[PDB]
RNA sequence: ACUAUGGUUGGAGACAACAUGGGAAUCCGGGGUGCUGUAGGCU
RNA sequence: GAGAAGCUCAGACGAGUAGGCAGGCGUGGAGGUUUGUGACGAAGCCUUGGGCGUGAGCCUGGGUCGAACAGCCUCUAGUG
RNA sequence: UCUAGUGGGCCAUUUUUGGUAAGCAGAACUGGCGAUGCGGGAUGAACCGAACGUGAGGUUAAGGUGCCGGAAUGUACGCUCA
RNA sequence: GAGUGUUUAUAGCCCUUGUUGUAAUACGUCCACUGGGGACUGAGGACUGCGGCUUCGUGCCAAGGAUGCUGACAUAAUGGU
């Protein structure tokens, strides 16, 4: 049993044998479907450029 | 030219404290010691009878024997590759209780009280100690606490 | 590198020291006088010998006596030989002084018009000492621990009264009656 | 197990978004938001087994760092902080992220069963070893390691110390100086992630 | 380079008997299977003791067996006693009770007295036949430190051990170093 | 490679001091860890705070507001030589104050053999007026009519064609 | 020259097998105690054993 | 100030800087000039 | 089944003087055994051929040679 | 439990003592050589790195990349003529 | 042709803000997202241990360790001395 170790990061079949959620896993989902404002603040800007 | 006297190299070890010579407080003779008590050995220079060796000064042991004017303390000392049991007969003038024992007793009593309350109210125990935990997020404010910008100071002699 | 080895009841037979006089010039000056101070500090650890100390003291005195007069300087030697150096016979042999970082060796208090020659005297005597040394224009008023501006500001109120070379200052302790009787010009504001 | 992995992933994203939003709120309002001090630290031994003082050697043995290029997970408390301070010249440590933790446990993941180093090639081995602690897969083993949970001691002790290779691209010019001085010793904060990436 | 401490690495136990007795080898062969294929710790104990040397397997007497099995708070009425060693006879026990004893070997007098007293004698293979898991068996061993070497072992100052003397009486290690009248005592 | 970080920290609040003062400074460090280390190193000189007794409440990298215009930067520094501690002022023309700081470190190392550990950056300012620009060589770059030939270099290698061991003809300038 | 005392290797030799702690026993010998205390404890233990045995027998 | 740990740091050296940690004393100034049971007496 | 003194699976580890232990190689002689080898050539010796074992060593081809010699299980020593 | 060898040590960092000093003598801590091969310091018991079964592949430590010699007659800013 | 001394002219610099910004670029981090190039290894030896497709078939697969399709030699080649 286990004569040779397969890397899950390289072997998709082993990556599926472990971690059943891998098939349903999602990534790179957009969450910026809005006005996307800026939160900087005059006080923060003045402190940043104080000297 | 080493000398192996009993009180060799004890010039400061057995010295009384500054402005602490003369009369010895009488509460030491009123302290009660029982077999199994954890005690600290601190030699008093004013009392020469029952004086333990300089090795046992500042050592903590367990009381095993009790006599009229002294007490028996069990100490473990390194004699090479093993510890050896030493039974020292020390007068009560050089013996004081270890406050760690009282702290341990208070901890046990607090644990028992919390356990009884948890049993009565059907709640969790949560009695074991924890190391210093990582700091939680805070909300350090700026109002009336405006940051002060600092710069390294130039080299200026003050002599 | 050895532990200090001074003369004591365990080290009795020691040759005599070489520097006997440590103050040269107008020793009985005044605080108001000599508003400038020059110090010869050491920038490294040394083991200055009594021979070098007396030789530099002689050189400084002989240079100072003919540039401003005998009544214009208060040269003081701030290093005292306290360490005995032993030598196997060809067992004390000599006396040396151990000097730490920033320790003063020679001190001269003069007027603001004699600052150049006060610096020059220590510069010339620098060659008589082993190792490196520095010359510092002290910010304090002569030998007084106070600064020049602070001293004159307090003297305007009247909290300082001279006494010989040094002076006495107002401190926030002691009998009120004695303080009043000793500091008449001092205005004790009720605050 | 898949549902548990989904919940763990959602928890990670929620925590990351919450930290970002709190920082943005602090910037907008002009105040300062100090985040939580890290609880999980990855430690890599950079010094070999030659010329080691007895105290540092004992600490590294108790930390299971007995070989060069060996990595372990620890929970950061006062005791571990002081121990890492004593062995500062001989190890590097920092805060690992989710990618580093999962890559370590997926590629170099070896468990200690019957005092043997067995590869984590199946969830059955992890379930057998840590099933009493509700750890049935490599995914919730990663969750326990990343988010320091109740059975972190058992989860971290079950994992054999990671045998990392020499870093690709090498170390800095001089390895046995502190990270602040320009070496590869002591605390390096998030730079442990780059070190592990090169060393994996 | 690996910094690993190797102190308790090589096991110091016996994995097989040092003797070449073919019948002891057969007994070891039987009890290897018994201990391996059963979860009873009795079989493992028997297998371990089968490897032990003669000095580690002291004899036990029938009187000792009777004394141990006839205690008031014992409840040992008719169950078998097991000893991995030799059962000797105690002639001081004039009347032998009825005992069921299993042993590696019996002395002729002990076996005869046990049989005469209505008891039975069995070997280890017979015991395995009767009680494969050792249920309701009183397992005993002889006194290991009753050997003559243990009265000398640990000899030293104030150890109260027997010295190695070629004879007995005065003029043999009963002088200076053994009494206060001659310098010091021990 | 250096970067400029603004670091804001404070002392841990105690029984006597429930609202500690916040201290900010700009530090040129390769990374944030070095920047925070420099912050504590400079704070220990004036205040009685340490890393154990203090905490960093903010650290932000600052980029040049106008990286695409040429400026003059005056840097006051205090450094330790082999004899004593000195204060110098230097001028560098650069489009980034971080680049001016890196040029300052290179120049000090090249001239006075001063390492990074022995140099303290007291202050960095931008001088937009030649009336305050004091270095003559820096000021000579501000004239509207500035021209000079290319600095004497090793000519153009131009790609991989310059990697030939031999050349058929002598070079020309 | 003789008289070459040193302690360089002594600590390593001691720690090779470690600093062994003595075995802890539930009961210690009464020869270290007071003579009067031990003499009275002998009778006290004898009566305690007799009372316990009588309780077991009668009950 | 001093000190544990580190460098193929500087310096001929003495020593110094830096890095990860611990951390005084004298002086000066502000405040204060004893606390603590039982049994009984006093316009 | 796998000379159970056997078969099978897995993990970790490997510097070494003085010194300790274990398992093996080689020599002389003794008991047992091998329808053991041999004047159609034993032992020994030479070898610019071959094979096996990590190694101590062993087997073998070709020459010379002439009378004894060996494998295995034990015993033994004036045994390298 | 039984027994062997050992009972001349030496080097380096740090703390030192005696000496003008010593590759000197005598102490404390740690790491080493002795018994430690290998890469580097041209050469070497101690210094740096690193502790060694027989091999393949990859990556490094200390140290280097003009030639001897494996690897940029690399990049950027300055200083120096001996 | 060598020089004043008023601020966009027949040019244009610097510092504020409105805007079409979710306007863009570098940098850090992540993708159980995806393309190639090169090298070393092939240990094990009937079967047993998960996922998908359903064609519900102890069928197929990159899933508990290499197989397949060809060619040239064979007083050559690879090996040993």
Residue by residue, DSSP assigns G20-52 as BPPPP-SS--GGGS-HHHHHHHHHHHHHHHHHH
Retrieve residue G9's tokens. Answer: 């290797």
Retrieve residue B80's tokens. Answer: 């090479």
Are F22 and F77 members of one domain?
A: no
The total of structural domains in chain F comes to 2
Q: Is the dihedral of CA C30, C35, C40, C43 positive or negative?
A: positive
Retrieve residue D43's tokens. Answer: 């430690």
Q: What whole-number distance in Å separates Cα of residue D118 and Cα of residue E67?
A: 53
User: Protein F144 CA to nucleic acid J80 C1', in Å?
Assistant: 35
Resolution, expressed in angstroms to one decimal: 2.4
Q: What whole-number distance in Å separates Cα of residue B131 and Cα of residue D79?
A: 7
* CB atoms D36 and B136 under 8 Å: yes
Closest-CA residue of chain G to B84:
G22
Contacts of D123 (CB under 8 A, 6+ apart): A18, D1, D136, D137, D138
Task: Return the residue matching tokens 């007793």.
Answer: B105
CB contact at 8 A, D55 and D82: no
DSSP secondary structure code for residue D67 in this structure = B
- Asked whether residue F16 is domain-assigned, the answer is yes
Q: What whole-number distance in Å separates Cα of residue A39 and Cα of residue E126?
A: 90
Q: What whole-number distance in Å separates Cα of residue G25 and Cα of residue G6?
A: 37
DSSP secondary structure code for residue B149 in this structure = E
CB contact at 8 A, C52 and C83: no
* CB atoms D107 and A7 under 8 Å: yes
D92: closest CA of chain F, how far (Å): 14
CA distances from C61 to C56, C71, C85, F128 (A): 8, 12, 28, 55
User: Protein A5 CA to nucleic acid K77 C1', in Å?
Assistant: 38
CA distances from F14 to C82, F17, F54, G58 (A): 48, 5, 11, 70
- Asked whether residue F10 is domain-assigned, the answer is yes
CA angle B49, B55, B57 (to 5 degrees): 65
Retrieve residue C166's tokens. Answer: 């040094």
Q: How do E80-88 and E100-106 pair as beta strands? A: parallel
Measured in degrees and rounded to the nearest 5, phi and psi for residue E122 equal -135, 155
Contacts of C99 (CB under 8 A, 6+ apart): C42, C45, C46, C47, C48, C79, C105
Q: Please, which experimental method was used?
A: cryo-EM
Are F73 and F56 members of one domain?
A: no
CB contact at 8 A, D149 and D55: no
Helical H segments across chain C, by residue range: 50-64, 115-125, 148-157, 176-182
Chain discontinuities in chain B, listed by preceding residue (C to N exceeding 2.5 Å): none
Continuous segment of H or E residues that includes residue F26: strand F23-29
- Asked whether residue F149 is domain-assigned, the answer is no
3-state secondary structure of C163: strand
Residue F71's nearest nucleotide, by CA–C1', is K14
Measured in degrees and rounded to the nearest 5, phi and psi for residue D158 equal -65, -35
Q: What whole-number distance in Å separates Cα of residue E17 and Cα of residue E32?
A: 12
Q: What whole-number distance in Å separates Cα of residue F106 and Cα of residue F96?
A: 15
Q: Is the dihedral of CA G3, G5, G9, G12 positive or negative?
A: positive
- Asked whether residue F172 is domain-assigned, the answer is no
Q: Is the dihedral of CA D159, D163, D168, D174 positive or negative?
A: positive
CA distances from G16 to B78, C184, E8 (A): 15, 80, 14
Q: Is D116 near strand I, with its CB below 7 A from some atom of it?
A: yes
Q: How many CB atoms are located within 10 Å of the residue C118 CB?
A: 24
Q: Is E29 near strand I, with its CB below 7 A from some atom of it?
A: yes
Q: What whole-number distance in Å separates Cα of residue D63 and Cα of residue D45?
A: 10
Q: What whole-number distance in Å separates Cα of residue D42 and Cα of residue D46?
A: 13
Q: Which of F44, F67, F90 is the last residue of a domain?
A: F67
Closest residue to I5 (CA, C1′): E16
Q: Is the dihedral of CA D161, D162, D165, D167 positive or negative?
A: negative
* Overall size of chain F counted in residues: 173
- Asked whether residue F23 is domain-assigned, the answer is yes
Q: What whole-number distance in Å separates Cα of residue E37 and Cα of residue E24?
A: 20
CB contact at 8 A, B121 and B105: no
Q: Is D89 near strand H, with its CB below 7 A from some atom of it?
A: yes
DSSP B71-114: EEEEEEEE-SSBEEEEEEEEEGGGEEE-HHHHHHHHHHHHHHHH
Are F75 and F117 members of one domain?
A: yes
DSSP secondary structure code for residue D179 in this structure = T
D42: closest CA of chain E, how far (Å): 20
User: Protein C68 CA to nucleic acid J77 C1', in Å?
Assistant: 53
CB contact at 8 A, C158 and C185: yes
Measured in degrees and rounded to the nearest 5, phi and psi for residue C36 equal -135, 145
* CB atoms E5 and D61 under 8 Å: yes
3-state secondary structure of C44: coil
CB contact at 8 A, F127 and F91: yes
Task: Return the residue matching tokens 């040396």.
Answer: C96
Q: How many CB atoms are located within 10 Å of the residue B42 CB?
A: 15
B8: closest CA of chain C, how far (Å): 21
Q: What whole-number distance in Å separates Cα of residue F161 and Cα of residue E182?
A: 107
Q: What whole-number distance in Å separates Cα of residue D200 and Cα of residue B43?
A: 60
- Asked whether residue F2 is domain-assigned, the answer is yes
A19: closest CA of chain D, how far (Å): 6
Report the candidate in E70, E103, E78, E73 with the shortest Cα–Cα distance to residue E89.
E103
CB contact at 8 A, E71 and E58: no
3-state secondary structure of D191: helix
* Overall size of chain C counted in residues: 191
Q: Do chains E and A touch (3 or more CB pairs under 8 A)?
A: no
User: How many CA within 13 A on the CB side of residue G17?
Assistant: 6
Are F116 and F87 members of one domain?
A: yes
Q: How many CB atoms are located within 10 Å of the residue A25 CB?
A: 12
Are F72 and F61 members of one domain?
A: no
Retrieve residue F164's tokens. Answer: 């030939």
Contacts of E173 (CB under 8 A, 6+ apart): E163, E165
From edge to edge, which strands make up the β-sheet containing D162-163? D162-163, D70-75, D40-45, D91-94, D186-189
Measured in degrees and rounded to the nearest 5, phi and psi for residue F167 equal -130, 140
User: How many CA within 13 A on the CB side of residue F48?
Assistant: 2
- Asked whether residue F86 is domain-assigned, the answer is yes
Task: Return the residue matching tokens 């070893």.
Answer: D129
CA distances from D7 to A9, D30, G5 (A): 21, 34, 69
Q: Crossing angle, helix D98-107 and helix D138-146, to 10 degrees?
A: 140
Q: Which of F42, F67, F92 is the last residue of a domain?
A: F67
CB contact at 8 A, D179 and D189: no
Q: Is D88 near strand H, with its CB below 7 A from some atom of it?
A: yes
Q: A touches which chains (3+ CB pairs under 8 A)?
A: B, D, F
CB contact at 8 A, C164 and C143: no
3-state secondary structure of C23: strand
Q: Which residues pair with C163 in a beta bridge?
A: C166
Q: How many CB atoms are located within 10 Å of the residue F83 CB?
A: 10
3-state secondary structure of C15: coil
Q: What whole-number distance in Å separates Cα of residue F53 and Cα of residue F114?
A: 32
CA angle D177, D178, D180 (to 5 degrees): 130
CB-based contact, C44 to chain F, within 8 Å: no
Q: G touches which chains (3+ CB pairs under 8 A)?
A: B
Continuous segment of H or E residues that includes residue F6: strand F3-11
Q: What whole-number distance in Å separates Cα of residue F20 and Cα of residue F47?
A: 12
Are F76 and F62 members of one domain?
A: no
Measured in degrees and rounded to the nearest 5, phi and psi for residue D80 equal -70, -35
3-state secondary structure of C95: strand
Report the candidate in D84, D93, D75, D94 with the shortest Cα–Cα distance to residue D56.
D84
* Overall size of chain B counted in residues: 159
User: What range does the domain containing F15 cover?
Assistant: 1-67
C-alpha E51, offset from chain centre = 12
- Asked whether residue F45 is domain-assigned, the answer is yes
Chain E 84-113 residues whose Cβ is under 7 Å from strand I: none
3-state secondary structure of F32: helix
Are F27 and F47 members of one domain?
A: yes
Retrieve residue F127's tokens. Answer: 């001088």
Residue F80, Ramachandran bin (φ over 0: left; ψ between -120 and 50: alpha; else beta): beta
Are F27 and F39 members of one domain?
A: yes
CB-based contact, D75 to chain B, within 8 Å: no
User: How many CA within 13 A on the CB side of residue C115?
Assistant: 11
Retrieve residue A51's tokens. Answer: 């000297």
CB pairs under 8 A between A and F: 10
Continuous segment of H or E residues that includes residue F143: none
Contacts of F113 (CB under 8 A, 6+ apart): none
Q: What whole-number distance in Å separates Cα of residue C123 and Cα of residue C136?
A: 11
DSSP secondary structure code for residue C162 in this structure = E
Are F54 and F108 members of one domain?
A: no
Q: Which residues pair with E60 in a beta bridge?
A: E87
Q: How do B83-91 and B70-78 pair as beta strands? A: antiparallel
CB contact at 8 A, D28 and A43: no
Q: What whole-number distance in Å separates Cα of residue F79 and Cα of residue F88?
A: 8
CB contact at 8 A, F7 and F59: yes
Helical H segments across C27-142, by residue range: 50-64, 115-125
User: Protein D50 CA to nucleic acid J5 C1', in Å?
Assistant: 28
Q: Using the CB atoms, write b or e for E52-65: b if 16+ within 10 Å.
A: beeeebbbbbbbbb
CB contact at 8 A, F140 and F114: no
Are F77 and F137 members of one domain?
A: yes
CB contact at 8 A, C42 and C102: yes
Are F72 and F102 members of one domain?
A: yes
User: Protein B27 CA to nucleic acid H42 C1', in Å?
Assistant: 36
Are F43 and F97 members of one domain?
A: no
Report the candidate in D47, D48, D65, D89 with the shortest Cα–Cα distance to residue D187.
D89
Q: What whole-number distance in Å separates Cα of residue E113 and Cα of residue E94?
A: 10
Closest residue to J27 (CA, C1′): G6
CA distances from A48 to A40, A42, C120, F64 (A): 10, 10, 51, 11
Measured in degrees and rounded to the nearest 5, phi and psi for residue F28 equal -100, 105
Measured in degrees and rounded to the nearest 5, phi and psi for residue G33 equal -95, 180
From edge to edge, which strands make up the β-sheet containing F23-29? B148-149, F23-29, F3-11, F54-62
Closest-CA residue of chain B to A50:
B149
Q: What nucleotides of chain J have any atom within 7 angstroms of a protein Cβ?
A: 1-2, 8-11, 16-20, 25-32, 47-52, 58-63, 76-79
Q: What whole-number distance in Å separates Cα of residue C92 and Cα of residue D59?
A: 51
3-state secondary structure of D66: coil
E5: closest CA of chain D, how far (Å): 9
Helical H segments across chain B, by residue range: 27-30, 99-121
Across chain E, where does the E strand assignment appear? 60-61, 80-88, 100-106, 120-122, 137-140, 178-179, 182-185
Measured in degrees and rounded to the nearest 5, phi and psi for residue F85 equal -100, 130
Helical H segments across E55-176, by residue range: 62-69, 108-116, 124-130
Q: What whole-number distance in Å separates Cα of residue C181 and Cα of residue D82?
A: 62
Report the candidate in E115, E117, E103 with the shortest Cα–Cα distance to residue E49.
E103
């Amino acid at each position: 049993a286990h004569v040779q170790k397969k890397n899950p990061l390289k072997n998709k079949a082993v990556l599926a044998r472990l971690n059943p959620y891998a098939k349903a896993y999602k990534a790179n989902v957009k969450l910026n479907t809005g006005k996307t404002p800026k939160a900087a603040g005059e006080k923060f800007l003045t402190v940043l450029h104080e000297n | 030219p080493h000398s192996y006297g009993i009180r060799a190299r004890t010039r400061y070890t057995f010295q009384r404290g500054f402005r602490e010579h003369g009369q010895i407080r009488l509460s030491t003779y009123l302290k009660t010691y029982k077999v199994g008590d954890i005690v600290d050995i601190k030699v008093n220079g004013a009392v020469q009878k029952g004086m333990p060796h300089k090795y046992y000064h500042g050592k903590t042991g367990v009381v095993y024997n009790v006599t009229q004017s002294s007490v028996g303390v069990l100490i473990y000392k390194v004699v090479g590759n093993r510890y050896m049991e030493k039974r020292v007969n020390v007068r009560i003038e050089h013996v004081k209780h270890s406050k760690c024992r009282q702290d341990f007793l208070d901890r046990v009593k607090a644990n028992e009280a919390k356990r009884k309350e948890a049993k009565a109210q059907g709640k969790t125990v949560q009695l074991r100690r924890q190391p210093a935990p990582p700091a939680t997020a805070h909300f350090v404010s700026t109002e009336n606490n405006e940051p002060v910008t600092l710069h390294p100071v130039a080299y200026d002699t003050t002599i | 590198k050895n532990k200090p080895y001074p003369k004591s009841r365990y080290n009795r037979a020691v040759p005599d020291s070489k520097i006997r006089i440590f103050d040269l010039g107008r020793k009985r000056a005044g605080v108001d006088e000599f508003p400038l101070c020059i110090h010869l500090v050491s920038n490294e650890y040394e083991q200055i010998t009594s021979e070098a100390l007396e030789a530099a003291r002689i050189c400084a005195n002989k240079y100072l006596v003919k540039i401003g007069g005998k009544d214009s300087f208060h040269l003081r030697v701030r290093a005292h030989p306290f360490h005995v150096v032993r030598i196997n016979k060809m067992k004390p042999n000599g006396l040396v002084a151990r000097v730490n970082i920033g320790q003063i060796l020679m001190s001269v208090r003069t007027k603001d018009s004699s600052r150049a020659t006060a610096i020059e005297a220590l510069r010339r005597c620098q060659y008589k000492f082993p190792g490196q040394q520095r010359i510092i224009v002290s910010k304090k008023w002569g030998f007084s621990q106070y600064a020049r501006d602070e001293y004159i500001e307090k003297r305007s109120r009247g909290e300082i009264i001279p006494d010989g070379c040094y002076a006495k200052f107002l401190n926030k302790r002691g009998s009120l009656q004695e303080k009043l009787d000793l500091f008449p010009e001092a205005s004790f504001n009720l605050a | 197990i898949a549902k548990r992995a989904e919940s763990y992933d959602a928890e990670y994203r929620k925590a990351e978004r919450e930290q970002i939003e709190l920082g943005r709120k602090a910037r907008a309002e002009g105040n300062y938001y100090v985040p939580d001090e890290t609880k999980l630290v990855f430690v890599i031994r950079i010094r070999g087994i030659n010329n080691i003082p007895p105290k540092a050697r004992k600490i590294m043995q108790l930390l299971r760092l007995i070989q060069i290029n060996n990595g372990v997970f620890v929970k950061f408390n006062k005791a571990t902080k002081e121990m890492l301070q004593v062995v500062e010249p001989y190890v590097t440590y920092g805060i690992p992220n989710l990618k580093t933790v999962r890559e370590l446990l997926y590629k170099r993941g070896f468990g200690k069963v019957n005092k043997q180093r067995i590869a984590l090639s199946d969830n059955a081995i992890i379930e057998a070893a840590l099933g009493k602690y509700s750890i049935l897969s490599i995914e919730d083993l990663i969750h326990e390691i990343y988010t320091v949970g109740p059975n972190f001691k058992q989860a971290a002790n079950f994992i054999w110390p990671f045998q990392l290779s020499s870093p690709l691209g090498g170390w800095r010019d001089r390895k046995f100086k502190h990270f602040i001085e320009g070496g590869d010793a002591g605390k390096r904060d998030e730079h442990i992630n780059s070190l592990v990436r090169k060393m994996l | 380079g690996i910094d690993i401490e190797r102190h308790h690495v090589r096991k110091s136990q016996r994995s097989k008997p040092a003797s070449e007795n073919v019948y002891l080898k057969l007994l070891v062969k039987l009890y290897r299977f018994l201990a391996r294929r059963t979860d009873s710790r009795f079989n493992k104990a028997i297998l371990k003791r089968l490897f032990q040397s003669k000095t580690n397997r002291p004899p036990i007497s029938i009187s000792k067996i009777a004394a141990l099995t006839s205690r008031k708070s014992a409840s040992l009425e008719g169950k078998t006693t097991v000893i991995v060693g030799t059962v000797t006879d105690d002639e001081r026990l004039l009347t032998v009770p009825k005992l069921s004893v299993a042993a590696l070997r019996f002395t002729k007098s002990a076996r005869a007295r046990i049989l005469k007293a209505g008891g039975e004698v069995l070997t280890l293979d017979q015991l395995a036949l009767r009680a494969p898991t050792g249920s309701n068996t009183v397992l005993l061993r002889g006194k290991k430190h009753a050997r003559e070497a243990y009265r000398h072992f640990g000899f030293g100052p104030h150890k109260h051990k027997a010295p190695y003397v070629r004879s007995e009486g005065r003029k043999f290690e009963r002088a200076r170093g053994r009494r206060k009248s001659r310098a010091f005592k021990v | 490679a250096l970067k400029e970080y603004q670091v804001v920290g404070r002392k841990v609040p105690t029984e006597h001091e429930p609202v500690p003062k916040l201290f900010r400074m700009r530090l040129f460090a390769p990374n944030e860890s070095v920047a925070k280390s420099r912050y504590w190193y400079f704070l220990k000189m004036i205040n009685k705070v340490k890393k154990a007794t203090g905490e960093i409440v903010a650290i932000n990298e600052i980029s040049e507001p106008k990286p695409l215009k040429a400026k003059v930067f005056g840097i006051w520094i205090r450094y330790d030589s082999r004899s004593g501690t000195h204060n110098m002022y230097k001028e560098f023309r650069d489009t980034t104050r971080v680049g001016a700081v890196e040029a300052m470190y290179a120049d000090m190392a090249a001239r006075h053999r001063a390492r990074f550990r022995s140099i303290r950056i007291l202050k960095v300012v931008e001088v937009e007026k030649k009336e305050d620009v004091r270095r003559n060589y820096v000021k000579q770059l501000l004239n509207p009519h500035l021209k000079f030939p290319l600095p004497h270099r090793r000519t153009g290698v131009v790609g991989l064609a310059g990697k030939k061991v031999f050349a058929p003809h002598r070079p020309s300038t | 020259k003789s008289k070459n005392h040193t302690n360089h290797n002594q600590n390593k030799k001691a720690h090779r097998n470690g600093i062994k702690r003595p075995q802890k026993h539930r009961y210690d010998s009464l020869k270290y105690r007071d003579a009067k205390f031990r003499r009275n404890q002998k009778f006290a233990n004898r009566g305690t054993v007799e009372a316990i045995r009588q309780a077991k027998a009668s009950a």
